[model samples]
Target: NVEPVGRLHIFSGAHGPEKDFPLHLGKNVVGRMPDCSVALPFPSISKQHAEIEILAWDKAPILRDCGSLNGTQILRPPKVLSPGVSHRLRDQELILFADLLCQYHRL
Candidate 1:
């Protein structure tokens, strides 16, 4: 059986309570857009802020910035993701979509 690549734990957001977003194989669009898999309706977030893809080969999660105004940031080193560039996500890494922080956990 296929397992989830990682889980996105949203501890904060503008329009909702805390939530856990599951990352599956393929691409997941995250933004204020209604079609986004992980949608957040915060003003700082763009219509398509970022993309998270889980490759089936090793079940690795990759993050890509979608040219957001506020930008996507990776904690620890605290670097902002460049628009249209893909970055590999590590287990327990902290991701900031605008100001909303989410933690990725391997599952």
Candidate 2:
């Protein structure tokens, strides 16, 4: 069996220790719904918040908003995800999931 190429560390908005979630070889979904791959289950989070698509270990993956209300953002460039668009995730990149914060790390 293959292990994850990378992982995502999700933290609370108000400065708490993050919960780590592995980034599998394919699509990793983040949302409040219990069925989501990474179920956040917070007040500010939508049912289907965002998606992380990892095609390979050597290349960058895609971070895209799944038409959520509050939207997603990349903290470094202060970039926001527009409608029907995606952000190319960088190694050790910081992120905001509405209010919840996250960091992506590759191994």
Candidate 3:
């Protein structure tokens, strides 16, 4: 049986409620553009903000900062991810994109 590689759970702000999103097993884009897999229409968020790639080989999700204006942050330990760099996300880890926030989970 087929299963989702990972899940992206989006949240509101630095501290906010989470919104459910569809689970997919490949590359997913997060941005303001409707073309993005996960569209975040906030102004602080860029047209093409960030990307999450769920690798079937590892069944793990890697987040890449897509050179966004405000940038993406990992809440605990408080590290701002470098643009163009791919960072592996841990389960239940909080990620901040501009004013928006989210969580990444492994399936």
**Winning candidate number (lDDT):** 2
**Residue-level lDDT tens digits of model 2 in 1-107:** 34888888887656456688778788888999987877887888889999998988888988899888898887767877875787888999999888888899997
Regions of candidate 3 where Cα sits further than 4 Å from its true position: 1-3, 13-18
Task: Compute each candidate's TM-score over C-alphas.
Answer: 0.85, 0.88, 0.81
Question: Each model's C-alpha lDDT?
Answer: 0.83, 0.84, 0.77
Q: Rank all candidate structures by their lDDT, best first, as comma-separated numbers.
A: 2, 1, 3
Q: Write the per-residue lDDT of candidate 1 for residues 16-87, one digit (tens) a residue.
A: 588887787898889998778877878988999999998873756889999999999986577989987778
| Model 1 misplaced regions, further than 4 Å | 1-3, 13-15
User: To one decimal, what is the Cα RMSD in angstroms of model 3 from the true structure?
Assistant: 3.2
2 or 3: which has the higher TM-score?
A: 2
Candidate 3 on 76-107: residue-level lDDT in tens?
56888888877877788888898786777776
lDDT value for model 2: 0.84
Residue 9 shift from truth in candidate 2, angstroms: 0.6
